Design an enzyme around this catalytic site. Structure first.
Site, PDB file in Angstrom:
ATOM      1  N   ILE A  10       1.644  12.119   4.880  1.00 33.77           N
ATOM      2  CA  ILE A  10       1.068  10.907   4.033  1.00 33.77           C
ATOM      3  C   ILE A  10      -0.181  10.486   4.049  1.00 33.77           C
ATOM      4  CG2 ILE A  10       1.264   8.712   3.407  1.00 33.77           C
ATOM      5  CD1 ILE A  10       3.717   9.441   3.573  1.00 33.77           C
ATOM      6  N   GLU A  12      -3.500   9.670   7.833  1.00 34.86           N
ATOM      7  CA  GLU A  12      -3.299   8.606   8.843  1.00 34.86           C
ATOM      8  C   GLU A  12      -3.490   6.835   8.513  1.00 34.86           C
ATOM      9  OE1 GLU A  12      -6.480  11.296   9.086  1.00 34.86           O
ATOM     10  OE2 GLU A  12      -4.620  12.080   8.149  1.00 34.86           O
ATOM     11  N   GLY A  13      -2.945   6.454   9.490  1.00 34.29           N
ATOM     12  CA  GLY A  13      -2.425   5.061   9.324  1.00 34.29           C
ATOM     13  C   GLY A  13      -3.205   3.967   9.812  1.00 34.29           C
ATOM     14  N   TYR A  15      -2.326   2.748  12.444  1.00 36.85           N
ATOM     15  CA  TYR A  15      -2.048   2.933  13.602  1.00 36.85           C
ATOM     16  C   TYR A  15      -1.415   3.875  13.946  1.00 36.85           C
ATOM     17  CZ  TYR A  15      -1.323  -2.428  12.769  1.00 36.85           C
ATOM     18  OH  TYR A  15      -1.625  -3.846  12.007  1.00 36.85           O
ATOM     19  N   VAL A  17      -0.580   8.679  12.370  1.00 38.33           N
ATOM     20  CA  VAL A  17      -0.011   9.273  11.705  1.00 38.33           C
ATOM     21  C   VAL A  17       1.033   9.399  10.843  1.00 38.33           C
ATOM     22  CG1 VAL A  17       1.027  10.788  13.197  1.00 38.33           C
ATOM     23  CG2 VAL A  17       0.228  11.610  10.412  1.00 38.33           C
ATOM     24  N   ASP A 123      -3.557  -7.961   6.927  1.00 42.01           N
ATOM     25  CA  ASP A 123      -4.449  -7.229   6.751  1.00 42.01           C
ATOM     26  C   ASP A 123      -3.929  -6.405   4.888  1.00 42.01           C
ATOM     27  OD1 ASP A 123      -5.726  -5.414   6.766  1.00 42.01           O
ATOM     28  OD2 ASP A 123      -4.789  -3.979   7.445  1.00 42.01           O
ATOM     29  N   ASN A 128      -1.921  -0.727   0.580  1.00 41.51           N
ATOM     30  CA  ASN A 128      -0.385  -0.612   1.032  1.00 41.51           C
ATOM     31  C   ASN A 128       0.247  -1.318   0.975  1.00 41.51           C
ATOM     32  OD1 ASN A 128      -1.169  -3.650   1.909  1.00 41.51           O
ATOM     33  ND2 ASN A 128      -1.919  -3.076   4.681  1.00 41.51           N
TER      34      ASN A 128
HETATM   35  C1  LIG Z   1      -1.919   6.620   5.535  1.00 40.93           C
HETATM   36  O1  LIG Z   1      -1.685   6.259   4.550  1.00 40.93           O
HETATM   37  C2  LIG Z   1      -3.027   6.051   2.905  1.00 40.93           C
HETATM   38  C3  LIG Z   1      -2.073   5.212   2.195  1.00 40.93           C
HETATM   39  C4  LIG Z   1      -0.637   5.762   1.808  1.00 40.93           C
HETATM   40  N1  LIG Z   1      -0.140   5.151   2.862  1.00 40.93           N
HETATM   41  C5  LIG Z   1       1.667   4.653   2.480  1.00 40.93           C
HETATM   42  C6  LIG Z   1       2.245   5.232   1.545  1.00 40.93           C
HETATM   43  C7  LIG Z   1       3.552   5.064   1.335  1.00 40.93           C
HETATM   44  N2  LIG Z   1       4.311   5.383   0.099  1.00 40.93           N
HETATM   45  C8  LIG Z   1       3.411   5.088  -0.808  1.00 40.93           C
HETATM   46  C9  LIG Z   1       2.799   6.969  -1.052  1.00 40.93           C
HETATM   47  C10 LIG Z   1       1.177   7.578  -1.568  1.00 40.93           C
HETATM   48  C11 LIG Z   1       0.784   8.381  -1.430  1.00 40.93           C
HETATM   49  C12 LIG Z   1       1.948   9.804  -1.305  1.00 40.93           C
HETATM   50  N3  LIG Z   1       3.012  10.076  -1.334  1.00 40.93           N
HETATM   51  C13 LIG Z   1       3.742   8.361  -0.966  1.00 40.93           C
HETATM   52  C14 LIG Z   1       4.412   5.007   2.353  1.00 40.93           C
HETATM   53  C15 LIG Z   1       5.680   4.905   2.044  1.00 40.93           C
HETATM   54  N4  LIG Z   1       6.285   3.546   2.798  1.00 40.93           N
HETATM   55  O2  LIG Z   1       6.136   5.106   1.461  1.00 40.93           O
HETATM   56  C16 LIG Z   1       3.729   4.421   3.916  1.00 40.93           C
HETATM   57  C17 LIG Z   1       2.311   4.963   4.196  1.00 40.93           C
HETATM   58  N5  LIG Z   1       1.433   4.309   4.956  1.00 40.93           N
HETATM   59  O3  LIG Z   1       2.812   3.940   5.666  1.00 40.93           O
HETATM   60  O4  LIG Z   1       0.667   4.884   5.228  1.00 40.93           O
END
Ligand SMILES: COCCCNc1cc(NCc2cccnc2)c(C(N)=O)cc1[N+](=O)[O-]
Length: 294
Positions: A10, A12-13, A15, A17, A123, A128
């Site tokens: 998905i 780099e968050g 905190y 990956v 935040d 998010n």
């Molecule tokens: C790494 O962050 C980038 C922002 C998106 N970040 C996130 C997006 C999510 N879903 C929507 C999604 C978006 C794109 C592709 N696939 C699913 C989820 C989740 N819990 O389903 C978690 C995070 N994250 O824990 O970060």
């Protein structure tokens, strides 16, 4: 991993990956976050664990907190898209007002729930806020800031955005109140409406001055105690306040009245999530389904 098959990265968050993954035993599809140094602070473990019970339809569910091999993984409910991507995808014609209103309404319900349990996000940002094909929107990562804090840069060095940061935070207040989340949500509301970030600062002072240029430089009349804040400087330029009619056109007066209350400088005067839910803006709220191409 071991019990989780990685489907796709998905990104780099803040905190660490994040991966879309499948639980090999149940087949459940989830979001797996590997949390960033040496030993995993017990306090964070106890705090994050408390979050497993903070359950609400508009809060991304924390399925498990795995503390093994002295590593930290958080397993979350998976949603297919985040609001940032959806906004970029809707830049053409914009998100229809009914959907903006439905999303704002649902987000306020989530905040009202967490805030009643004394849990803050701190935040909030489009990235998010997660959405599905049913028209639901959910807040992700509530409570993590308190447990892990908020970094300047992510582990890959990306700059964490300051665009949604409340002014009391920028001025150095050490104690955050639930008002910080209402501010962030007000900023997100304004961005959905105009299709442009409200306060896109690229440094703490640029962020603060952008807020001052639009809402006026705060003083003791509108914000009792502001001149005593840790980072307040009497040398701050004094800008006059602009009209909301010019800040988020062409939003109607119900929308502008609510936004104005979500952006009051004084955290104590800022509208609460529960009171915002009762605002006339929501008189005709509905639950439209978004056009999502996955
Ligand atoms: C790494 O962050 C980038 C922002 C998106 N970040 C996130 C997006 C999510 N879903 C929507 C999604 C978006 C794109 C592709 N696939 C699913 C989820 C989740 N819990 O389903 C978690 C995070 N994250 O824990 O970060």
């Amino acid at each position: 991993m071991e019990n989780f098959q990685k489907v796709e990265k998905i990104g780099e968050g803040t905190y660490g990956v994040v991966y879309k993954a499948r639980n090999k035993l149940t087949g459940e599809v989830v979001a797996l976050k590997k949390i960033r140094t040496e030993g995993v602070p017990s306090t964070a473990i106890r705090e994050i664990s408390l979050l497993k019970e903070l359950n609400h339809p508009n809060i991304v569910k924390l399925l498990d907190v795995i503390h093994t091999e002295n590593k930290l993984y958080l397993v979350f409910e998976f949603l297919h898209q985040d609001l940032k991507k959806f906004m970029d995808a809707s830049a053409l014609t914009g998100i229809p007002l009914p959907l903006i209103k439905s999303y704002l309404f649902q987000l306020l319900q989530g905040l009202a729930f967490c805030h009643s349990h004394r849990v803050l996000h701190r935040d909030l940002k489009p990235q998010n806020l997660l959405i599905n094909t049913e028209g639901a929107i959910k807040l992700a990562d509530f409570g993590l800031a308190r447990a892990f804090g908020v970094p300047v840069r992510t582990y890959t060095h990306e700059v964490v955005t300051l665009w949604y940061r409340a002014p009391e935070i920028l001025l150095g207040c050490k104690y955050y109140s639930t008002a910080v989340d209402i501010w962030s949500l007000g900023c997100i509301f304004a961005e959905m409406v105009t299709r442009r970030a409200l306060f896109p600062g690229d440094s703490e002072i640029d962020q603060l001055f952008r807020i001052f240029r639009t809402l006026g430089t705060p003083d003791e009349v509108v914000w009792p105690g502001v001149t005593s804040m840790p980072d307040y400087k009497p040398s701050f330029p004094k800008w006059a306040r602009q009209d909301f009619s010019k800040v988020v056109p062409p939003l109607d007066e119900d929308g502008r009245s609510l936004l104005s209350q979500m952006l009051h400088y004084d955290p104590n005067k800022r509208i609460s999530a529960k009171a915002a839910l009762a605002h006339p803006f929501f008189q005709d709220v509905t639950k439209p389904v978004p056009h999502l191409r996955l």
